[PDB]
Amino acid sequence: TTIVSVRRNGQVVVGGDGQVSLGNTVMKGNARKVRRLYNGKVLAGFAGGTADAFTLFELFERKLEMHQGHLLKSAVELAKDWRTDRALRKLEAMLIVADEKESLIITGIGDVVQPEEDQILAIGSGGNYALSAARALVENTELSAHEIVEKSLRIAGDICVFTNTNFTIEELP
């Protein structure tokens, strides 16, 4: 799987591939791994099971609601529940969330993580390939966030055997 997010010129984009694998074979090629949350104001991508994601996103939504849409505070609270609840600790998904203010990665083992000056984030087995391509593109071209995410996902999909080239890409605003 490869999920990558790029923020450039007032726009933030989260995009992911569509491959669901079991061992060395493909169970599904058109999975949608990026969704819109909080009435469309938050983009969320996930590497992991759909049931794990449903659980984590519903919980994140509850947090956003109680924290007046504050992404970082909601994310910190989510990570706290994630590592403290015995049921939630069983969830191994990895998440990327982004709103008009900031982008973050959240995982059960690593808590919350913010980007570097780059404003590029990536997760999944193919994450570092998309990251390498995105950094090259951000630093050497004037491409929009959307173009960079699409191009980076393609490059990662052509290298990682667990990432395909059927993408779901969401952009804000």
Instruction: Report the binding-site residues.
Output: 157, 160, 163
Instruction: Kindly state the smallest distance separating residue 10's Cβ from a copy of itself, in Å.
Output: 21
119 part of the interface to a copy of itself, by CB under 8 A: no
29 binds a copy of itself (CB under 8 A): yes
Torsion, Cα 86 91 95 97, to 10 degrees, reads -50
CB atoms within 10 A of CB 11: 14
Contact with a copy of itself (CB under 8 A) among 44, 112, 145, 172: 112
In one letter, which amino acid is 134? A
Could you say which of Na ion, a copy of itself, none residue 17 binds, taking C-beta under 5 to 8 angstroms by partner kind?
A: none
* Smallest distance from a copy of itself to CB 62, Å: 13
Count of residues in the chain: 173
Task: Name which position in 67, 132, 150, 171 contacts a copy of itself (CB under 8 A).
Answer: 132
Distance from chain centroid for Cα 84: 23
Give the one residue of 155, 167, 168, 172 binding a copy of itself; rule: CB under 8 A. Answer: 155
Residue 55 has φ and ψ, to the nearest 5°, of -60, -50
Burial (CB < 10 A; 0-12, 13-18, 19+), residue 124, is buried
Which secondary-structure segment (H or E) carries 47? strand 42-47
Say whether residue 158 binds a copy of itself (CB under 8 A).
Answer: yes
CA distance 57 to 126: 22
Q: Does 167 interact with a copy of itself (rule: CB under 8 A)?
A: no
Judge whether 36 and 48 are in contact, CB under 8 Å: no
Q: Which of 1, 121, 114 is nearest to 50 (CA)?
A: 1
Active site annotation includes 25? no
Q: In angstroms, what is the minimal distance from the CB of 128 to Na ion?
A: 12
29 interacts with, out of a copy of itself, Na ion, none, CB within 5 to 8 A per kind: a copy of itself
Segment 75 to 104, residues that bind a copy of itself, using CB under 8 A: 76, 79-80, 82-84, 86-87, 89-93
Chain residues 55-74 in contact with a copy of itself, contact rule CB under 8 A: 55
The residues carrying an active-site annotation are: 1
